[PDB]
Amino acid sequence: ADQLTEEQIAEFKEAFSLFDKDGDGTITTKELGTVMRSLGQNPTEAELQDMINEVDADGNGTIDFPEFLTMMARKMKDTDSEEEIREAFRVFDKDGNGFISAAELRHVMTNLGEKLTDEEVDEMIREADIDGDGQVNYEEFVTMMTSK
């Protein structure tokens, strides 16, 4: 009996404010193509529409707030597929794979355009590296962002 909090709507809301580099606040083909293209890709057009229907429950061409949570909430049973999170992992690591470095992430953290650098990230990797070996491993990663 605490779902009346605001930490939730605040978390997802932050994702958009960062993703929707425009203002609408919805993941669309133009918003996806832009960001996605900034990573290093360039799929066709018809391929995008297919990427929309396969996830656009309603059909407004773009998913908003209810649709977003509905896609992350409406979990059709379970397939035990951890490939998703995995990919996100291989992404952060542009070079070697198994640990995160300051310089490595810095580049993957600058691609965006917020207000981070080496010092700030340092506080993020340091606090994240509970052990303190020097870099972030998979444990501290699957132990800090673990599915409560």
């Binding site: 978390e11 997802f12 932050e14 994702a15 960062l18 993703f19 993941i27 996806l32 960001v35 996605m36 990573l39 890709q41 391929e47 297919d50 990427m51 396969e54 996830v55 490939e83 998703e84 999170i85 990919e87 996100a88 992404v91 953290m109 506080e123 993020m124 994240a128 800090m144 962002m145």
Partner: peptide, 26 residues
């Protein structure tokens, strides 16, 4: 307030969208 959350989640939105493609054989 300061974590790799909003960061990982964001990429997850664009990554999942891509994975939604197919990723399957027969």
């Amino acid at each position: 307030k300061r974590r790799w959350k909003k960061n990982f989640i964001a990429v997850s939105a664009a990554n999942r969208f891509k994975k939604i493609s197919s990723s399957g054989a027969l």
